[PDB]
Symmetry: D3
Subunit: 132 residues, 6 copies
Amino acid sequence: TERTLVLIKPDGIERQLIGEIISRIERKGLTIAALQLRTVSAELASQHYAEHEGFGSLLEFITSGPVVAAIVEGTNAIAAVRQLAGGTDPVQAAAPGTIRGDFALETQFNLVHGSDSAESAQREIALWFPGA
Amino acid sequence: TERTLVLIKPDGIERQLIGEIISRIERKGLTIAALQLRTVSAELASQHYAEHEFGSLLEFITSGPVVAAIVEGTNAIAAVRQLAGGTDPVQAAAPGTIRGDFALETQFNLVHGSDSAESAQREIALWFPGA
Amino acid sequence: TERTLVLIKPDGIERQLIGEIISRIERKGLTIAALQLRTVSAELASQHYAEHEGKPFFGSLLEFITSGPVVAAIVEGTNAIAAVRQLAGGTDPVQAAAPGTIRGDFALETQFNLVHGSDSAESAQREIALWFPGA
Amino acid sequence: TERTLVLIKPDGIERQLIGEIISRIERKGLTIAALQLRTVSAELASQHYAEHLLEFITSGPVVAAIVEGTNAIAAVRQLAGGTDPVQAAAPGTIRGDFALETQFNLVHGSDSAESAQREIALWFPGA
Amino acid sequence: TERTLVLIKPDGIERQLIGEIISRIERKGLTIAALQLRTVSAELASQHYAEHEGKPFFGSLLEFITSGPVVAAIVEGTNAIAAVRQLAGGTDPVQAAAPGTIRGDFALETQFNLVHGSDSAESAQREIALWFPGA
Amino acid sequence: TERTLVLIKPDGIERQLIGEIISRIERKGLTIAALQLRTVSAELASQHYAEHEGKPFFGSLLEFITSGPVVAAIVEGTNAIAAVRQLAGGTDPVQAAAPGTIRGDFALETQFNLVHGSDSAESAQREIALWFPGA
C-alpha cells in the first residue's frame, strides 16, 4: 500500500496541534502506520533537506525542538497528505480547510511536511524509520 | 423554494459519516425536507445513473444501504455541490468539502448532490415521488 | 443485536441539530439501522406517549410532537439502549442532564429537550414496533 | 504589529456564529485586541459604507473586533472567503461553510492596510 | 428574561479560547446581550470578588484578574444563570468540574480556571450592574 | 513536573481515534513528552496488567493488548495524573464513564474502552519505567 512520511514540525508541537493534524489524516481515511515524538540531530536534519542544499535555516528550526514523525498509509496517501497540508505559504498559497490554511500565517512556521512524491516518500521513510 | 437531492452512498454509511454530512448541510443554512435510510433496487440505480450510461456505479449503489434526502433552501442546488466537492476527492475536490476532507478515490466518494435544476427535479421525483 | 428507538423532536429539527445528534450516536460506536423524517399523527402521538396519559404535561406532549416533523431512527449496537440514554442526558437539560450530553450541551428546558431514546428493553421493543412496524 | 477590523454582521449574531467566527480567527494564530457588541447608528453606518448595506447593518447588533498578528489583514480575508458565499467563497471559509447569499454573508474584514486604519479609527477611536 | 454575567479571564484569552467559550454558550441556546474586551482596574477587581474577602486567596484573585485583558459578557435566556454555571463547571477543573464543561475540558488548576458565571440571581444582578452599568 | 502514562489501545487505533484522543489531552493544557506507536509483547502485557492477575478478565486483557499496535505516551503537566483519568472516564464506558470523556463519548463495552491512564503517582512511575525506560 502507498505510504508517505509526515512530520509535525516544532511549531506544530508548540501550538498543541499534534492531535488536530493526526485527526485530519485519520478522517481522510488514511492510517498511521508508525508514529514517534523525537529530537532531530544536525546529521538527520541535513539528510532530510538534501534536495535544498543550494536551506540553512531549515536545519536550524527543525532542530530547535521535538518533532513528531509518522508513516501514513492508504490509497493515494502521498497526494492526499499534500492536499490536507496545503501549499507552502499558509496565507498566500494554502487553501482554506487545509492544515496550513486553517492554522498558520507564515512559511517559516507552517506546521507540517508531507513527502512530495513516491521517490521522496521512499527516501524520507528510509531516513526517519529505517527498517519500516 | 429551491430543492435538491442528496445521496449518502454506502461508503458514507459504512464510515459513520451520516451525521457529519448532514451537519455540514445544516450549518450551511439549508434544511432537510425529507430523509430516509434505504436499500436501492437495480431499476432505481439505472434511472439515477441514466446520464452515465456505469457498471461499477450501479453495482456499488446496490451493495448496501444509502441515505436519501431532499435538501431545501436558497441556492440549495449549487450550495450542496459546493459542500460536496468535485468528483475526484484528491485531484478535484477542495479542502473543506465532504470529498476533500473525507475521501481518497472517485469510486468511494461518499455523497451525491443533484447537478442542476433539471437533475434535481428528476432525481427528487425518482427517490421521493409525491414530494 | 440490541436495538433502541431514537426520536429527534421538532425543536431538534428546527434548531438544525439532526446531523449533530446522529454524529454523536455514530461516534459512540452505534449503527443507524433505520432512519426517517416524518410527520406524527395524533394517533401515533397518543400511543407513543401512552405511558404519560395520567400526567399533567400529557396534553402539550401530544401537540408538541405533532407541531412539526420529527426524525425517527432505530439505533443498534452493544448496550445500545443504555448508551443512547447516556448520550441524550437526563430529562431536564439544566438540572439533570450532564455536560457533554445532547440535552446538557444544547438545551435549556424540559419541554424543548431535543431528543428521546427508549428507556428500557421493554420500551425499546414497544417503541420500535410502533414507529417501525416491519423492522 | 499588523491589525485589521472584523465585523460580525447582524446575520452572524442571529445565527449564533459569534463563537465560531472568533475561534477561526484564534486558531489561525491571530489575537483579539479589542471586542465589542454594539448597535450601529446611521451616521456610523454611512461612514463605514462610503467606498462601496446601510439598511441591514442597522437592523440589529453587530460584533466589532480588532484582530492583530502577522499578515492579519490578508489572513482574515482568507478566513472569511469571497463575497458571494456560494459562487466565490472557498469551502473551508466562514462564508463558504455557513452562508448562501451575498446580502447575508455574516462577516467583514478590512480589505487593505489603508482600509484597516480607517475602519479601526471609525469603530475603535483611540485604539 | 433571565440574565447572567460571564467573564472570560486573562488565561482564557491567552489560551485563545474566547471563541470556544462563546460557542458553548450559543449552542446551549443562550444569547449574547453584551460583550466587551477590557482591562480591569484594582477597584473593580475588589468589587467583583467582594464575597471572597475572607479567603486566603483573595489577593491572588485580584492580582490575576488585573494581569491582562478580560472579556465580559451579559448572557441572556431561559434558566441562563444555572445554564452558564453548568456549562462552566465546578471551580476546581480536575477535582470538581465535570467532563464536557469548559473547566473540565480545558483547565488544570483553580487559579487558572478560564471563566466565571454569576452564581445566583442576586450575584448576577450585582455583577451585571458592576460590569455593565446602564445595561 | 507531574507525568503520567497514557496508552491508546488497539481499538483506539482501529477506530481512527488517535488524533481525537491526543487533541483532548492537549486542549486540557497537558503536553506530550513522549509518543510511540508500537507492538506489545506478551512479557510487556503481563507486566502492565500484573495487578489484575487474579481477576476473571485477566486473560482477556492480555490477549487484547497484544492483538494489534498501541500508542504509548508520556503526558506531562500540573495535575497530569488526575487530569488524564478525568479525560478518559470510568472503566465501563456506559455505566461509569461520564458524557464528555473519551470512554463516555466513543465506547460501549469495558473490553473495548479505547484508552488507559495511570491511576496514581505510584502507578504512573511504574508504568513509565516499564513503557519508557529511559525517560
